[model samples]
Target: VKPNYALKFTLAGHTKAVSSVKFSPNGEWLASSSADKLIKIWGAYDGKFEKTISGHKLGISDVAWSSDSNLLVSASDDKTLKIWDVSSGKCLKTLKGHSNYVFCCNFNPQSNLIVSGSFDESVRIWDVKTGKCLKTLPAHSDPVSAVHFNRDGSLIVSSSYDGLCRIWDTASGQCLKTLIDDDNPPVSFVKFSPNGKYILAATLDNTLKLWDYSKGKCLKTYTGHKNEKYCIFANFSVTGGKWIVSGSEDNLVYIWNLQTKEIVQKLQGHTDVVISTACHPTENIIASAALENDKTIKLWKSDC
Candidate 1:
């Protein structure tokens, strides 16, 4: 089937592989991090370069915006996470505790807390105001690949190379549940649904799994886009969470209708593997980043 979306812009500035790209909560800005150890912010509507933040001595892995969109947090191989003031592009705080590369970091929905997962096989929660580590969860036997907070910030979910996705209670730092499939390959990324009803996970087995977190059941499995080994990212559409969008090692971005479990659209533009993707908070726009030599972020808009 022909896709309803078209490429809107190709953002070019990164000197190395672009690892992640995310849209701000207000949809006014898009931020991307790269192996060049730099984070670049762009005007979401015009695709203009707004600012560049540099400090990480190693490659940046993931980035996220605060609930208010006034702050940005990035995780890096430098073994630390940095919070930056969006307006001034100033580093506000450096969160340190992990002894290895920090792979993923996210701000709670309340925007006052940060959750980070690292190669040290741990998940750490930080206070955004004090920049202090409030809790440390020695989460997985292997590297923690992704971490995310539920809508109310009462729960946190983390995926790991140990082939598990674990849910935790934020206040007590206690494990509530562990999700494991019989043939679980390394779980690369996990995200909470907009309404907090489900969890979406991408695995090295080349598939996406949707889970009923409350019931502890796997509702559906999505396949089509290749994700064999890369830490390709995926997310649900903002509007009612009716669609799932993901980057693939197949060099395309796939959007699946949540109920149908079929690929409704395959977005093509990148020359190499598409490693990161994010949907706009309020608009029918999607941003994707490619890996290695194709270090660019491409924005897309639905024609319909």
Candidate 2:
């Protein structure tokens, strides 16, 4: 069933394309990274401006919140990952190992370890406190587009332009599975389901699929949004994981019934490609951002 969603705010703060938007674990704040080389933080409940951070030399590709929601991590084209204090807005540590652009970063569920993937084709694990590269695995043949830690933090899932998604043991660096579609299309994003039984992947094949990671089976395929160009992102709805929401190159947000594998709603709010979506953890709300041509973030809420 489709829920009624209403626009709550239209934030026109970023001067460039927004690469990612993530709500903290506590659901108190929402952070967005942009090509303008800035990180903007907003009050998730009030939709008001709170902070603007600038330190990365180039565009930030991704941002993730610590499990406690006290800190933040960012991946940038400047070839590094920067940890930051959310309240004080200070750069706590700069971890460097990737030889090229760092595309994605994720904090372990414990908030002690961070995993990142980069254009250098390496997957690195970092110590959150010491800012040291704990381990490095030559994980992919092409640029890594996304990386995420599973619920308990024992495993990591990564997708690459090499057209493969691999599941790795965080402690041993041993890859357990390399998921491949019959077409071998590049996978732009991969995230473990909340239950850790499956992975939701966004592919440049203009489709998204939910995979039974253990068996490398395609459980469901979602279509209806254009995604042949950019590394678009797709995420499970936060309320109950009953629905799937995704960004589209078609300038709209697409929502699919997780069980039915059919598009239920198309959110038409932007004139340019919709590139990112971050659903609120405890509310019937979602935040979305578009490409440079649109340059705005919109918050939508369902009627209570």
Candidate 3:
């Protein structure tokens, strides 16, 4: 039963730490960026290295594929975002609006709009078709760690070193509400539920908290990591949407059943801090990026 619940894959090739890995919306390809200063695209199932894309002057922090999977957007410590042609592996446009390192960026689900968060304490929205900056949101007091669009593409949720989370109106770029962590730990991640009614965030507080965005309140908090640690990453399963998984510096990946507010399972494998983790768009697949000598990304799936 354990084997059925654990299927592992090691994606090798990067010389430095793997920073982020994202599966395409269609699940056909898995794209990863690394501190080694390269982005690699792979065949999701077979782990075949498709192409090595490089151009960044500094380490790559995150790579996200557009909704149509035709273009790929990469943010780097170089304080710039580059849009690439995934098919030809060519750099199409280089967006240089951020004043500091760009940690992560994502595209609107339906429109050709792009959103980016940076270490400069600002989030900017881009009109991808024209390579123009649409609006700049200046609310975070510190580096913006991550930014994500809700499933419906109506709202944007951003996490930052301010130890607070903000949900904004995507169209107007208005700051609707700010979710503060009174405990004062930086939020490493913030993701919206499939229905876009709730928000889940992982924090340096060693816990993952769920918030009712519609009501401007925290619904529940999931705790149980070992020792003193920080929640480095967390994500929601695509299928049922009832399960939320989080990784910590404690070297464990926890699966929490939100409906019952209880831990359903704990995934243990990484020997160091789990830096990041992501859920496949459709499959029961989970990929985690961690700090391990020579190897990083670990792909997992439910046991049949």
lDDT of each: 0.92, 0.90, 0.80
Ranking by TM-score: 2, 1, 3
For each candidate, give its TM-score against the true structure.
0.97, 0.98, 0.92
Provide backbone clash counts, one per model. 0, 0, 2
Residue-level lDDT of model 2, residues 1-304, one tens digit each, is 5766678898889999999999998888999999998999998887898989889999998999998999999999999999999889999999988999999999999999999999999999999999999999889999999999998999999999999999999999899999986778888999998889999999888989999989878899999899998887788885844788998998998888898988877888888888899889988788899998998888888642
The digit string of per-residue lDDT tens for model 3 on 159-233 reads 987888899999999999988744778887788877888898877666777899768788888888642343265
Q: Report the lDDT of model 3 for residue 77.
A: 92
Task: In candidate 2, list every pair of residues with a backbone clash.
Answer: none
Top lDDT hit: 1
Clashing pairs in 1: none
- Lowest-sum lDDT 10-residue window in model 2: 233-242
Candidate 1 residue-wise lDDT, 225-252, digit = tens: 8988788889988543468899998899
